[PDB]
Amino acid sequence: LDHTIVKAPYIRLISEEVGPKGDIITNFDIRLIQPNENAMDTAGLHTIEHLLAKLIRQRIDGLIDCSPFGCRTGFHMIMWGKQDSEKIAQVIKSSLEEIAEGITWEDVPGTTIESCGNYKDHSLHSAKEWAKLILSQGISTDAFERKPI
Amino acid sequence: LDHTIVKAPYIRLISEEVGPKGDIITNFDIRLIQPNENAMDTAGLHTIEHLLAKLIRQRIDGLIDCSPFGCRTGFHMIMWGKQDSEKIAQVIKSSLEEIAEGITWEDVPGTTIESCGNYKDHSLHSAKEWAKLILSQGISTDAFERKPI
Amino acid sequence: LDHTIVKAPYIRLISEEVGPKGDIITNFDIRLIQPNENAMDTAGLHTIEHLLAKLIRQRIDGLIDCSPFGCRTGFHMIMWGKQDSEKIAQVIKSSLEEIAEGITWEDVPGTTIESCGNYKDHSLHSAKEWAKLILSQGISTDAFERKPI
Amino acid sequence: LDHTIVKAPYIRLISEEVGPKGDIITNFDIRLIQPNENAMDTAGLHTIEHLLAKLIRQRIDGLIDCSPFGCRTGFHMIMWGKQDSEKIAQVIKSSLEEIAEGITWEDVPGTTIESCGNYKDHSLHSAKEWAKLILSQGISTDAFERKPI
Ligand SMILES: [Zn+2]
Ligand SMILES: [Zn+2]
Ligand SMILES: [Zn+2]
Ligand SMILES: [Zn+2]
């Protein structure tokens, strides 16, 4: 991927893989922030990871994992089956809208020393303001051209 | 998982997943740091993420993804097929040893503004030093008892 | 200073600088975290920095600045005039108790986009939890020998 | 200060304080990054803090302290004696030009486990790239109007 030509926020299919018995696994680039222009702080990124794990699964089947990028500009989404980015775009948009306006502290799973490996590094405040910032730019179903929604 | 009773560094099989056509996937908790005692800085975590993606693929097949935890105490690793924590521990130990000694700056893939979403946030110094710190503690095949390899 | 042999949390006087006309300025190392064993996440550190600035001024005059170390293990405190490392200890301890016990979000100053240069990177959750952790280890008045206030 | 309308990078005199014997201390806002649009990662910020400490002293007298902002968009600079925002801008510009081109790993002070409280969290690569990015935008002598030197 040439990171200098994409336009975030976008949803991008990274790859599809076929297992031996023929199951398909799709990998998605969920870019929340424009590469090299900004990066999410660890606390909000961490809280958004916990929330997205929950919210996505309420909205769609087949989620294997949703882990953040080391570069902190988004999330790697792994799913069973072919998926297509417009459905994924709507799942992410809807989830972000819930984080922006709906989630309270008690809806954030795993914020104790027993259930999380860095439980101090959380921030609902950061997650809500990031979600709002990301939503205000529109979620595009294409990475190279703006196609919001 | 009770993060208070584990002993890091460890490799722990999280789950095996069967897809619709019977294909097996395995998810691994690659725990490099004791939960809630410390956390990797973003720069070294990011460089390690890049190097692991390359080093793991050189040593084993069927890697689907290896993404850092939002808590910054390790990596979530996903593979095709049944795998068991013993061979994964070896692959991880061997990769960390190469980071610790062998690797130079030109061996780190994706450190340019075109190839990476946050290309400034890298540190080979950090990656090397973290690698050696983790190695010095030993990599266990069990999360609850020290069984180093 | 040899960071390997200090015992944190501690307060340490670093130096007294004398002005051109004889005013004295004192520098303090406020070490909240054991060097190289851990480090505070940016959001907690940022929130604590906002709170400390206000809370310290409620308790003592002559504060010139209280800035976070680049290493994220504590704060640099600059004060007008000669000052006692023991009274500094009480002022910090008293401040941490309030963050731990009696601070709400509305009591954190400068948490808006107009008033702070990274207003999303805040966490009262992190600040409160770190303050509790620090207080429970005790604040020493000496860097090399546990002398808790 | 209204952070929404400043135009970074800039140098801004925050305040002068007088001591009982008539000594002047000047405080500066060294804003390297546009508030709320981006933030320096900890490693780059940490390495720059170590370098700015020596580089500034080689160029001007009276430096009391140069500490990072908790918001990670710049540095707080404290000096003996009367200001000169234009002269301060020149020193900062000159120091950044040195970081971008003249500094090697061995030129960074405090990068061992004895001499630094988080010695793994350093990155010459990050410091150099940030220094280049900042210089490409120009250092203004006025926070509100671009007067780049
Ligand atoms: Zn967590
Ligand atoms: Zn990257
Ligand atoms: Zn702030
Ligand atoms: Zn340092």
Contacts of D43 in chain B (CB under 8 A): 41-44, 121, 123, 126
Cα C107 to ligand 1 centre (Å): 27
Q: How many separate helices (H) and strands (E) can be counted in chain C?
A: 3, 4
From B44, B118, B121, residue closest to D120, measured CB to CB: B44
| C38 Cβ neighbours under 8 A, 6+ residues apart | B37, B38, B39, C73
Mutation for testing the A interface, residue in B33, B37, B48, B71 having most A CBs under 10 Å = B71
- Closest-approach residue (CA) in chain C for A40: C121
- Which ligand sits nearest to residue B110's alpha carbon? 2
Distance (Å) from CA C37 to ligand 4 centroid: 13
CB within 8 Å of chain B, chain A residues 82-111: none
Least Cα distance to D85 among D134, D135, D15, D23 occurs for D15
Cβ neighbours for D62, distance < 8 A, ≥ 6 positions apart: D79, D80, D81
Q: Do B39 and C41 touch (CB under 8 A)?
A: yes
Resolution for this PDB entry, in angstroms: 2.2
Q: How many CA atoms lie within 13 A of B117 on its CB side?
A: 27
Q: Which residues of D touch A130 (CB under 8 A)?
A: none
Are C140 and C11 within 8 A, CB to CB? yes
Known binding-site residue numbers of D for Fe cation: 46, 50, 116
The sign of the dihedral angle between the CA atoms of D85, D61, D18, D50 is positive
Which one, of D130, D139, D145, lies nearest residue D88 by Cα? D139
Give the residue from C72, C87, A136 showing the smallest Cα distance to D72.
Answer: C72
Residue A39 phi/psi, 5-degree rounding, is: -155, 145
* Encoded tokens for A50: 């916990």
Per DSSP, C145 falls in state S
What distance in Å separates the CA atoms of residue A90 and residue C87, rounded to the nearest whole number? 57
Give me the DSSP letters along C51-96.
HHHHHHHTT-S-EEEEEE-TTSSEEEEEEES---HHHHHHHHHHHH
Mutate to test the interface with B, among C37, C38, C133 (most CBs of B within 10 A): C38
Contact yes or no for C23/D17 (Cβ under 8 A): no
- Please give the Cα distance from A142 to A13 (Å, whole number): 9
- C43 inside 8 A of chain D by CB: no
B43/D111 CB distance under 8 A: no
Instruction: Pick the ligand that lies closest to the CA of residue D115.
Output: 4
How far is residue C112's CA from residue D4's CA, in Å, rounded to a whole number?
10
For residue A120, give the nearest of C111, C119, C130 by CB distance. C130
Helix (H) or strand (E) holding D85: helix D85-101
Residues of C whose CB is below 8 A from A44: 43, 120-121
Within a 10 A sphere around the Cβ of A133, how many other Cβ atoms? Answer: 18
Q: Find chain A residues with C-beta within 8 A of D37's C-beta.
A: 37-38
- Cα angle: A136, vertex A94, C124; to 5 degrees: 70
**Amino acid identity for residue B41 in this structure:** D
In angstroms, what is the span from residue B96 Cα to ligand 3's centroid? 37
- Nearest chain A residue to D42 by CA distance is A41
Q: Any CB–CB contact under 8 A between B116 and chain D?
A: no
Contact C125 A123 (CB under 8 A): yes
Q: Distance (Å) from the C-alpha of residue B38 to the closest C-alpha of chain C? A: 5
Q: Which residue of D has its CA nearest to A130?
A: D36
Q: Is C65–D70 a contact, with Cβ atoms under 8 angstroms apart?
A: no
CA distance B39 to chain C (A): 7
Tokens encoding B10: 């460890």
| Tally of structural domains, chain B | 1
- Expressed in angstroms and rounded, the spacing between residue A144 Cα and the centre of ligand 1 is 32
Indicate the residue of A46, A72, A121 with minimum beta-carbon distance to B118: A72
* Chain A closest-CA separation from residue C107 CA (Å): 15
Q: How was this structure determined?
A: X-ray
**Hey, of A67, A73, A77, A83, which one would you mutate to test binding to chain B, going by the most B CBs within 10 A of its CB?**
A67
B39 part of contact set with chain C, CB < 8 Å: yes
Domain that includes residue D25, residue range? 1-149
Dihedral of alpha carbons C68, C74, C76, C77, sign: positive
Closest ligand to C-alpha of residue B67 is 2
What secondary structure letter does DSSP report for A36? T
The CA distance from A29 to A13, in Å, is 6
Angle of helix A85-100 relative to helix A124-137, nearest 10 degrees, comes to: 130
Nearest alpha carbon to residue D105 among C34, C36, B128? B128
Are A31 and A10 in contact by the 8 Å Cβ rule? The answer is yes
CATH number for position D26: 3.30.1360.80
**How far B86 CA sits from the closest chain A CA (Å)?**
23
Strands (E), D1-149: 10-18, 24-31, 63-68, 74-80
Cα angle C14, C18, C22; round to 5: 150
End-to-end CA, chain B:
23
Contact indicator for B90, B149 with CB cutoff of 8 Å: yes
Q: Kindly state whether B16 is in contact with chain D, defined as any CB-CB distance less than 8 angstroms.
A: no
- Contact of A63 with chain D, judged by CB distance below 8 Å, is answered with no
Distance of CA A132 to the CA centre of its chain: 14
